Amino acid sequence: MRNVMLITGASRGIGAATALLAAERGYAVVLNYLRNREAAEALRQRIERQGGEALAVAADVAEEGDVERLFASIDERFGRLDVLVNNAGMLEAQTRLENIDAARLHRVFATNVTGSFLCAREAVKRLSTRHGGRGGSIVNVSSMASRLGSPNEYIDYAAAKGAIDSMTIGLAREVAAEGIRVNAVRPGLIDTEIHASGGEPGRIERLKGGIPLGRGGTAEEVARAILWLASDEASYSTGTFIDVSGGR
Amino acid sequence: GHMRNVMLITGASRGIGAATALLAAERGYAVVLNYLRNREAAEALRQRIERQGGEALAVAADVAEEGDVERLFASIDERFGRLDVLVNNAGMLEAQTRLENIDAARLHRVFATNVTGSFLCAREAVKRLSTRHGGRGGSIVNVSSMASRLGSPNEYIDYAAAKGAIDSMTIGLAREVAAEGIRVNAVRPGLIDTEIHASGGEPGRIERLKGGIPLGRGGTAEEVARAILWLASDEASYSTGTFIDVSGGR
Numbered sequence: 001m002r003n004v005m006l007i008t009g010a011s012r013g014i015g016a017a018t019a020l021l022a023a024e025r026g027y028a029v030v031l032n033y034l035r036n037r038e039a040a041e042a043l044r045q046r047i048e049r050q051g052g053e054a055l056a057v058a059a060d061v062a063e064e065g066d067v068e069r070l071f072a073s074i075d076e077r078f079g080r081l082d083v084l085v086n087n088a089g090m091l092e093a094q095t096r097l098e099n100i101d102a103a104r105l106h107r108v109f110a111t112n113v114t115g116s117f118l119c120a121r122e123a124v125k126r127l128s129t130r131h132g133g134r135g136g137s138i139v140n141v142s143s144m145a146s147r148l149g150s151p152n153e154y155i156d157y158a159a160a161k162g163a164i165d166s167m168t169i170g171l172a173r174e175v176a177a178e179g180i181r182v183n184a185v186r187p188g189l190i191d192t193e194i195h196a197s198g199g200e201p202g203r204i205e206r207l208k209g210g211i212p213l214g215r216g217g218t219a220e221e222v223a224r225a226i227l228w229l230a231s232d233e234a235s236y237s238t239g240t241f242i243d244v245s246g247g248r
Numbered sequence: 249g250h251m252r253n254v255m256l257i258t259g260a261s262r263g264i265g266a267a268t269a270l271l272a273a274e275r276g277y278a279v280v281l282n283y284l285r286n287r288e289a290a291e292a293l294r295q296r297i298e299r300q301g302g303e304a305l306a307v308a309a310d311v312a313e314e315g316d317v318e319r320l321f322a323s324i325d326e327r328f329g330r331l332d333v334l335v336n337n338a339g340m341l342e343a344q345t346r347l348e349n350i351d352a353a354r355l356h357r358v359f360a361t362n363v364t365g366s367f368l369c370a371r372e373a374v375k376r377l378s379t380r381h382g383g384r385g386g387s388i389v390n391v392s393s394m395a396s397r398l399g400s401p402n403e404y405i406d407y408a409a410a411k412g413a414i415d416s417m418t419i420g421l422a423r424e425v426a427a428e429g430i431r432v433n434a435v436r437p438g439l440i441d442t443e444i445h446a447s448g449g450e451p452g453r454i455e456r457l458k459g460g461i462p463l464g465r466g467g468t469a470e471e472v473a474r475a476i477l478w479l480a481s482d483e484a485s486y487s488t489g490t491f492i493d494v495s496g497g498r
């Protein structure tokens with residue numbers, strides 16, 4: 001009876017905040033993770049102990065076979081799907097483009113772009129009115145990097161997010177007639193572990209004087225925008241974006 | 249001075265790239281004609297250019313392959329000893345389809361040519377053009393597509409996404425290399441009369457869609473070439489990180 005939401009990369013950061021908020025709003029939640037099983041299981045436990053429904057599933061979204069298995073686990077546990085949040089994403093050490101090699105480009109596009117395509121594909125196969133579904137929504141997680149370009153940091157990642165923006169528009173226009181809305185959020189500088197993963201734990205503090213609102217954002221702020229776009233309150237919005245960037 | 253500037257055109261053997269190479273060869277450039285599957289077309293173009301009084305070098309390289317890209321630029325170093333402009337024109341798409349039928353293998357191929365190839369060539373160009381590395385500066389022109397804005401629904405959202413990646417790389421690289429003398433811009437062609445539409449499964453695509461183009465016709469490869477050359481030229485000396493749509497209003 002609950003609507004079912006898959007959040008890719010739900011073990012930490014924005015995905016974890018989105019999973020907890022979705023459970024508070026009455027969704028059954030699928031928490032996908034890769035390298036942080038214990039973090040995902042702790043979130044599952046928090047949701048279940050409070051009377052909610054949650055399923056934690058390891059899957060590398062870059063890997064077609066893992067994505068197939070992830071969605072098969074959803075089919076088995078819940079037998080339906082209503083929302084996909086394409087949140088899993090990653091970046092590598094800050095760099096100039098002249099030091100980005102093909103292996104890095106493959107890894108960065110594989111997680112951020114291919115993974116979002118593959119999960120969107122399997123979600124369409126469950127949500128679409130062509131295929132036994134009731135319709136639903138997809139929310140992609142982009143980045144202000146798509147607009148700003150991440151110079152001297154990670155133009156590869158900025159390009160991956162530009163790809164997400166175009167996929168959001170194309171897929172929205174492609175599956176509108178099948179009951180599926182597709183939108184994206186573009187977070188700005190949000191306090192998660194991702195900045196440290198690029199080599200700069202203090203990135204927000206360095207940049208905050210230039211953010212119009214004068215502070216970094218929170219994972220919970222992003223989660224609220226994701227949930228709004230996934231909800232029926234956004235019933236006439238498809239192919240659009242909510243920037244969650246404090247004016248950046 | 250008496251020496252021509254040097255322009256690499258990726259995917260110069262056919263279509264937009266071939267028109268760009270022919271025009272550039274008459275605009276003060278010795279041209280490097282990169283090809284992959286169409287050596288004979290590239291060699292004929294080289295001969296046409298050398299008979300119009302120009303200079304041209306044809307070089308096989310798959311831009312998706314880092315080793316081929318390294319060798320491509322080494323060939324330029326050996327022949328000309330200099331580089332001034334990169335046109336990241338090589339691109340491709342696969343059969344018209346819906347996203348639910350696009351697999352990982354297709355995504356990898358499409359991103360490899362369109363995105364990775366443009367990154368890898370831009371990287372080799374920066375190493376040579378940058379004033380930090382002893383260069384004189386120069387420019388890079390990426391070839392995007394109106395697909396980045398329209399999304400190519402029901403045709404090739406994968407390719408649209410690849411071109412969205414190019415748009416963001418254009419902006420980011422422009423900002424990253426502005427202070428070392430390199431400008432970076434892009435063209436977004438709309439419906440241009442080349443073989444690419446047939447390669448997607450629809451030779452008649454322009455005829456199907458032209459009634460909806462404001463200008464009422466497809467564009468030509470020569471039209472795109474002129475915009476590329478403008479952005480590469482010194483007339484665009486205060487433009488970096490920008491786009492020109494060549495789409496007839498689409």
Ligand SMILES: NC(=O)c1ccc[n+]([C@@H]2O[C@H](COP(=O)([O-])OP(=O)(O)OC[C@H]3O[C@@H](n4cnc5c(N)ncnc54)[C@H](OP(=O)(O)O)[C@@H]3O)[C@@H](O)[C@H]2O)c1
Nearest residue numbers: 009011012013014033034035036061088089143190192194
């Ligand atoms: N924080 C920001 O400032 C910011 C700004 C704009 C956009 N974003 C975007 O926000 C999204 C969430 O990132 P975050 O900031 O929350 O970062 P984070 O703290 O690094 O969390 C990343 C999450 O993605 C998962 N993940 C990474 N690669 C994966 C893969 N191949 N398969 C499955 N899961 C994978 C991780 O799972 P495991 O840990 O279990 O491996 C983790 O749950 C990403 O798309 C990111 O690009 C973040």
Ligand SMILES: NC(=O)c1ccc[n+]([C@@H]2O[C@H](COP(=O)([O-])OP(=O)(O)OC[C@H]3O[C@@H](n4cnc5c(N)ncnc54)[C@H](OP(=O)(O)O)[C@@H]3O)[C@@H](O)[C@H]2O)c1
Nearest residue numbers: 259261262263264283284285286310311338339393440442
């Ligand atoms: N025509 C349009 O309507 C249109 C619209 C928007 C954007 N574009 C873009 O314009 C650019 C040129 O397209 P086009 O219409 O002229 O296409 P085209 O007629 O199909 O020609 C493609 C060219 O790219 C080369 N190429 C393809 N893959 C390559 C690779 N891996 N390495 C090196 N060269 C490669 C081909 O060389 P070989 O034949 O020697 O393999 C050929 O010269 C592409 O980036 C395309 O995305 C075209």
